[PDB]
Amino acid sequence: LLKANKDLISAGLKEFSVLLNQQVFNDPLVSEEDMVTVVEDWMNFYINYYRQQVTGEPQERDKALQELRQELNTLANPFLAKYRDFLKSHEL
């Protein structure tokens, strides 16, 4: 209904964007179980946090909820992939 909504989304967006790019895997470092668990938890906080951090008609929330979930679903796709590759690489 107002920029307020778009601001909340953009805030999560910029949050995940800046946080995602802030991930610099040096060497074999942590296992995928830690990263994966961190990824899952984060998405879960967003879903529950955003589900309750909206205003206006129920249609607005539902759209944002799906659009966000879709954003993360794709956004995270290249992260876990590049990560799995990074881990499988330094094996031998």
Side-chain angles (χ1 to χ4, degrees):
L1 285 163
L2 317 96
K3 318 102 205 76
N5 269 291
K6 283 121 263 261
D7 266 294
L8 186 83
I9 213 157
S10 199
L13 258 149
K14 192 59 177 315
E15 259 53 298
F16 199 38
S17 77
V18 184
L19 176 94
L20 282 165
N21 105 104
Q22 244 60 318
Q23 278 261 329
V24 281
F25 305 124
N26 259 221
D27 251 35
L29 59 105
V30 63
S31 190
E32 253 247 325
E33 208 264 301
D34 226 81
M35 181 88 290
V36 159
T37 301
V38 182
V39 180
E40 259 242 280
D41 214 273
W42 283 343
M43 261 103 80
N44 266 253
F45 110 70
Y46 287 128
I47 186 166
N48 292 95
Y49 173 45
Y50 292 130
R51 264 230 270 98
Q52 282 164 126
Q53 194 64 259
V54 225
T55 48
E57 49 248 317
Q59 264 260 73
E60 218 283 312
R61 298 117 158 279
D62 260 289
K63 175 203 132 97
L65 259 40
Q66 57 175 78
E67 227 94 86
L68 220 55
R69 215 284 135 77
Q70 187 233 274
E71 224 104 297
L72 299 142
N73 262 327
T74 28
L75 278 185
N77 209 74
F79 194 4
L80 301 180
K82 70 130 120 98
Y83 199 42
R84 283 241 276 199
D85 225 78
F86 168 78
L87 222 151
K88 65 183 59 176
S89 65
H90 56 248
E91 175 147 287
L92 64 108

